[PDB]
Design a protein around this ligand. Structure first.
Ligand SMILES: C[C@@H](C(=O)N1CCOCC1)N1CC[C@H](NS(=O)(=O)c2n[nH]c(-c3ccc(Cl)s3)n2)C1=O
Ligand SMILES: [Ca+2]
Lengths: 234, 52
């Protein structure tokens, strides 16, 4: 996250961190239930073997609530393509269930129509992660969050050098120095409604981080709600 | 602005228009209250709530 603020105690409890063999975070995820994590499909090709960490806000300290979980089943969308990052979505089934506690809790999955007319028409959503704090920097050791305005669909296609499919939406700022960034991929985009936070996006891609005239590109979770549902049923 | 378009039909979470009336529902792990509008968590750590 470029800009924004640190997630304070209990503020981003649905954040997950995909960690490689060296225990280094390379992507985020969203806690959906005690057994399921939502992430980006392109994140799967970033490590050979990886586990999922939850309840962590500061990767340098051990604040008692953190917990590593092995992945049992990887369920990648069969239509994912590295060419355009269309269908950039995957669900992970863990071997052991997550214990909810302070800093560890699921985000809500919304219903499609209500989400599209009610959540995605709000002014902003919230993205969070342990990604880079600047385009050229190193991963954050602190979990960060950032309010990102939803971006007009036409404006977004016009700004992009790459195709924006209907399985994607844009969020961020035209010129302001705030945006998701590398390492934040796979992480949550959530939208608040009456103090309840609903999953609305997955951090997917961007041309750099916080560039002028460029926005963040997110997987449109409302397009995959039945798919997610099916994936969690088995 | 009528029904669900008017302040989310007074619903806490999901709103649907059915036979010209508002119908509220809630995410998994919540139960719809007696007023048919509020959503009550069934247990601890309901989805979507910051842990404070
Ligand atoms: C342009 C894009 C890219 O590789 N694409 C090819 C596939 O089709 C989609 C576009 N790209 C360059 C590398 C980059 N990966 S990254 O370094 O992990 C990264 N940089 N910025 C970002 C994000 C900024 C805002 C969001 Cl949201 S993700 N991710 C990324 O997505
Ligand atoms: Ca820690």
């Amino acid at each position: 996250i470029v800009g924004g603020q640190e997630c304070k105690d209990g503020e981003c409890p649905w954040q997950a961190l995909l960690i490689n063999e060296e225990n280094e975070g390379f992507c985020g995820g969203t806690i959906l239930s005690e057994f399921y994590i939502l992430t980006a499909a392109h994140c799967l090709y970033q490590a050979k073997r990886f586990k999922v960490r939850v309840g962590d806000r500061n990767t340098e300290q051990e604040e008692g609530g953190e917990a590593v979980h092995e992945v049992e089943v990887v369920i990648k969308h069969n239509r994912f393509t590295k060419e355009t990052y269309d269908f950039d979505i995957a669900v992970l089934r863990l071997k052991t269930p997550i214990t909810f506690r302070m800093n560890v809790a699921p985000a809500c999955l919304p219903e499609r129509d209500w989400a599209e007319s009610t959540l995605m028409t709000q002014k902003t959503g919230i993205v969070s992660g342990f990604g880079r704090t600047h385009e050229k920097g190193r991963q954050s050791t602190r979990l960060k969050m950032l309010e990102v305005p939803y971006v007009d669909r036409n404006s977004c296609k016009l700004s992009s050098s790459f195709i924006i499919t209907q399985n994607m939406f844009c969020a961020g700022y035209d010129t302001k120095q705030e945006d998701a960034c590398q390492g934040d991929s796979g992480g949550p985009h959530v939208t608040r409604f009456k103090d309840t936070y609903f999953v609305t996006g997955i951090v997917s891609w961007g041309e750099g981080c916080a560039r002028k005239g460029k926005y963040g590109i997110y997987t449109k979770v409302t397009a995959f709600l039945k798919w997610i549902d099916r994936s969690m049923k088995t | 602005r009528k029904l669900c378009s008017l302040d989310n039909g007074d619903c806490d979470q999901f709103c649907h228009e059915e036979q010209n009336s508002v119908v509220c529902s809630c995410a998994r792990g919540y139960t719809l209250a007696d007023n048919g509008k509020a959503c009550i968590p069934t247990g601890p750590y309901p989805c979507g709530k910051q842990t404070l």
